[PDB]
Structure formats: structure tokens, C-alpha cells
Amino acid sequence: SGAIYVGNYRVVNRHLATHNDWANLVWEDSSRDLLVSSTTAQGCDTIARCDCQTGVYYCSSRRKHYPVSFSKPSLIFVEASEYYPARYQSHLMLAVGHSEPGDCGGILRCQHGVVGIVSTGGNGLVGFADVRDLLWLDE
């Protein structure tokens, strides 16, 4: 579980969004597994605007942060689940690192700020849904 709080926005995995998130919906994209809802309180997370391919992510199944090299956002095939049929997830980045069900929502950060959140994984890999192209989160 986990979310990004920037300005008047909350960014969470779309498959884990709550009733409040859907009642206060700003934007959602099932192909990216992302949903953004509005908040009354102000958020101070900084979003990175870069093309970093290294960073650090939070892994809740280990209560630890790990450094990773990750790929550029692209379309990657993702297996069926209680949340989605089999499909290509877009804007997804892969890294070699530990992740297991329950880890979605962990933040990936580089020196510039928040890069994305855990969205997929398994087999010694971890997948992150990128948020660096959503320029409107800041303004």
C-alpha cells in the first residue's frame, strides 16, 4: 500500500483506489494502473522531472529501501489478476529487486524527487508506474 501526496492531489495505484478516491476523481488510466484524487489538505512531495534510470525504492515486505537501476517507461505485458485481465501496462519501468503482493504503492525516488510507485513485480523483478510525465500534478 502507499500513495504520493503533491499539492491538492493524491496519486495511488488504480487497483487499490478507495471510495473517497473515486468520489473525488481527477484522472485515472487503467492501462497505467494509476488514479489521482483531490484532497483538501496540502501535500509537499516533490515530483521529479528528469530521465533518471537509477534511484531508491521502498519495499514494505522487507521494511527496507533498496537502490535500483531501472528501465525507461514502456509497454510491458502483465498477467491477469482479480483487478485486471491480461494486457500491456504502459509507462512501466522494470528493475532487478525484491517485490511481492503487498508491495504496490512503495515510492521510487531519484535525487530530483518522486519518480513513481510500485505497480507489478515477481521473479526477482519490480515494476514501477512512472509519474514524471504528469506535469499537471505541480500546477
Ligand SMILES: CS(=O)(=O)c1ccc(Br)cc1CC(=O)N1CCC[C@H](C(N)=O)C1
Ligand atoms: C505477479 S506477483 O508475483 O503476484 C506480484 C509480485 C510483486 C508485486 Br509488487 C505485485 C504482484 C502482483 C501483481 O503484479 N499484480 C496484481 C495487482 C495489479 C498488478 C497490475 N499492475 O496489473 C499486477
Ligand SMILES: [Zn+2]
Ligand atoms: Zn531524476
